[PDB]
């Protein structure tokens, strides 16, 4: 029937800060971080994703939906100005293209 | 040539190993961005704090700071949940720079035209509606939105808020029709709101602009 433990646990840890967020401690998570496709290039997987939203602008290359934008807000809650000179400076842009 | 259906299990190839890459959106973190967003634009972001004004200078307020094409620079400003009538007012706030930059005493000089929006002051949530259309607008500049605008501006005061949208130019036409797009994100209705002012009048601050509804 059971031989040993049928519960085993796999990183689980999600317990960061008591819920917030600081422009260091985000900015400090580019630091290392990895780059981008674009946004419909990259398909956010937490309850949203941005397929074809502002695709649909024509032209798209870097076209950020309205709403996706508004996520960000969610998550950036971090009054940044000084940090940003560090990590925006850091930003990096991927054009869009592979196929042809 | 067929549709979205996916009737079959050969199009898809249920099968991975150490596939490269992995990209992390501040949405599905929450607290590790791995991936930076840009963008195809450029876009300053300036937020004056009118107060020393008194003998200091426009350009001795201004704050000038995130000038990227991203996402996470300018939305952080926004976390200061300021809005149109969640800050200090008497407040401005500009980012733009596809096509110009120096602001309206210049940028004019690039848009041409100055779309401005008065409110007599609500609090509700209409800073979501005057941003969806200004992220969107640097956010967004490649086509449809900011085809070819210049930037947008925002002046808080006591009367409530009124932001600024700058247009390349285009003609003028294509603007009131854009303004009236802007005039529903003041959430009004009917009552027009809406201010025009022509750069020729903007840096010189002439009178008898274009329009005010
Ligand atoms: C926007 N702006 C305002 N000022 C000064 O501040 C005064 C108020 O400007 P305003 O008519 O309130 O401009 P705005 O609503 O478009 O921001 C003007 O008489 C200008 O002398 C400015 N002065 C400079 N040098 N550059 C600017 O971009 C600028
Ligand atoms: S919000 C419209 C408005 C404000 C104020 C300056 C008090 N006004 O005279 C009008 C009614 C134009
Ligand atoms: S502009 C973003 C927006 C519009 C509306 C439909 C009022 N919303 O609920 C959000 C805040 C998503
Ligand atoms: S603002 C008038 C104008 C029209 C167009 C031909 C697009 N232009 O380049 C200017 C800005 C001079
Ligand atoms: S309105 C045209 C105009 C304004 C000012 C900034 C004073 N100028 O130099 C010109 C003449 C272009």
Redesign the interface.
């Not at chain 1, 290392?32 to 946004?39: F, G, H, Q, S, W």
């Not at chain 1, 998550?75 to 100005?81: E, G, H, P, S, T």
């Not at chain 2, 939305?75 to 200061?80: D, E, F, M, P």
């Given at each position: 029937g059971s031989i040993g433990l049928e519960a085993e646990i796999e990183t689980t840890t999600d317990e960061?800060?008591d819920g917030t967020?600081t422009?260091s401690?985000?900015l400090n998570?580019?630091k290392?971080?990895?780059?981008?496709?674009?946004?419909f290039?990259?398909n956010?997987?937490?309850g949203?994703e941005g397929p074809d939203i502002?695709y649909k602008?024509?032209?798209?290359?870097?076209?950020?939906?309205?709403?996706?934008?508004?996520?960000?807000?969610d998550?950036?809650?971090?009054?940044?100005?000084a940090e940003?000179v560090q990590?925006?400076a850091?930003?990096?842009?991927?054009p869009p293209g592979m196929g042809r | 040539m067929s549709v979205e259906e996916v009737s079959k299990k050969f199009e898809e190839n249920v099968s991975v190993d150490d596939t490269t890459?992995?990209?992390?959106?501040?949405?599905?973190?929450?607290?590790?961005?791995?991936?930076?967003?840009?963008?195809?634009?450029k876009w300053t972001l300036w937020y004056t704090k009118p107060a020393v004004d008194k003998s200091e200078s426009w350009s001795d307020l201004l704050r000038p700071?995130?000038?990227?094409?991203?996402?996470?620079?300018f939305?952080?400003?926004?976390?200061?949940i300021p809005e149109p009538h969640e800050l200090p007012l008497k407040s401005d706030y500009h980012v733009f720079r596809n096509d110009v930059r120096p602001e309206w005493e210049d940028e004019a000089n690039a848009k041409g035209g100055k779309w401005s929006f008065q409110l007599c002051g609500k609090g509700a949530d209409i800073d979501?509606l005057w941003?969806?259309?200004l992220?969107?607008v640097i956010?967004?500049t490649?086509?449809?939105?900011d085809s070819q605008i210049n930037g947008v501006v925002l002046s808080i005061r006591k009367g409530g808020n009124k932001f600024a949208l700058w247009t390349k130019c285009e003609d003028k036409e294509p603007l009131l029709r854009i303004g009236g797009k802007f005039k529903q994100v003041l959430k009004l209705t009917d009552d027009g709101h809406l201010e025009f002012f022509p750069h020729c009048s903007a840096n010189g601050r002439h009178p008898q602009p274009s329009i005010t509804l």
């Open positions: 960061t800060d967020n422009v401690h985000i998570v580019l290392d971080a990895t780059p981008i496709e674009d946004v290039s990259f956010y997987p937490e949203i502002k602008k024509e032209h798209v290359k870097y076209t950020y939906g309205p709403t996706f934008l508004l996520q960000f807000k998550k950036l809650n971090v009054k940044a100005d940003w990590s925006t850091s930003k990096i842009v991927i | 890459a992995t990209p992390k959106t501040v949405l599905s973190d929450s607290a590790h961005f791995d991936v930076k967003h840009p963008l195809n634009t700071v995130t000038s990227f094409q991203t996402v996470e620079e939305w952080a400003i926004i976390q200061n979501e941003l969806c259309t992220l969107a956010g967004e490649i086509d449809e939105d």
